[PDB]
Amino acid sequence: APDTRP
């Protein structure tokens, strides 16, 4: 749930 965008 932080910025887990690859």
Partner: single-chain antibody
């Protein structure tokens, strides 16, 4: 080569105000959350603020230490993030970095500001070239889990920070394969499998707790021989 470049720091009196800027290049800035993190001799790395995307209506969160005094903002058209600092205190003194991506891959060189839960890591470890060394990162709250999204960041001399691992065990792009992230005995862990002389550096972990980050105190790794 992604680049982040902070500006706006200086030498200021307590009670004053100042706005920092950070310009990004080499990645799709608008797709990622951005953070400010600061470094003092006395408090190590401290996460300050985050800002999310245009689809989150640019939602922000702050460390309790700066809440009500600092404001983070961004301008996606200029690939820039900002930090408005009001009611500066001596304790705000430090080097301020903009950082983000998976979750702390990229850091700027920092801008110096001079005003005039506990995460535990090993103070120091000593290794030699070709050895396998494991650094650890403990939470005062209980076991570290994948819900803490452990990151590992390396500091090389004169404040050159690079993110190594995010999301527990995801290696940031172009990070050497000798680095790996894990969970071991309810701590997060960073393993260097075949340490190299250039790995002598300070290593910080950061753990996520639902809506904020806490950085550990860092481990000084010496590589002798």
């Amino acid at each position: 080569q992604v680049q982040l470049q902070e500006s706006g720091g200086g030498l200021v009196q307590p009670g004053g105000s100042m706005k920092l800027s950070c310009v990004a290049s080499g990645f799709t800035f608008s797709n990622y959350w951005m953070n400010w993190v600061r470094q003092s001799p006395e408090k190590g790395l401290e996460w300050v603020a985050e800002i999310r995307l245009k689809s989150n209506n640019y939602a922000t969160h702050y460390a309790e230490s700066v809440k009500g005094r600092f404001t983070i903002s961004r301008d996606d058209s200029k690939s820039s993030v900002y930090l408005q600092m009001n009611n500066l205190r001596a304790e705000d003194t430090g080097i301020y970095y903009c950082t983000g991506v998976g979750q702390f891959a990229y850091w700027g060189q920092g801008t110096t500001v001079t005003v005039s839960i506990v995460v535990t890591q090993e103070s120091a470890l000593t290794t030699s070239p070709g050895e396998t060394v494991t650094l650890t990162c403990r939470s005062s709250t209980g076991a570290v889990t994948t819900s803490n999204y452990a990151n590992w960041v390396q500091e090389k001399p004169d404040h050159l920070f690079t993110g190594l691992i995010g999301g527990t065990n995801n290696r940031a792009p172009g990070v050497p394969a000798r680095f790996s992230g894990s969970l071991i005995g309810d701590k997060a862990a960073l393993t260097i499998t075949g340490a190299q002389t250039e790995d002598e550096a300070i290593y910080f972990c950061a753990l996520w707790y639902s809506n904020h980050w806490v950085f550990g105190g860092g481990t000084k790794l010496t590589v002798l021989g």
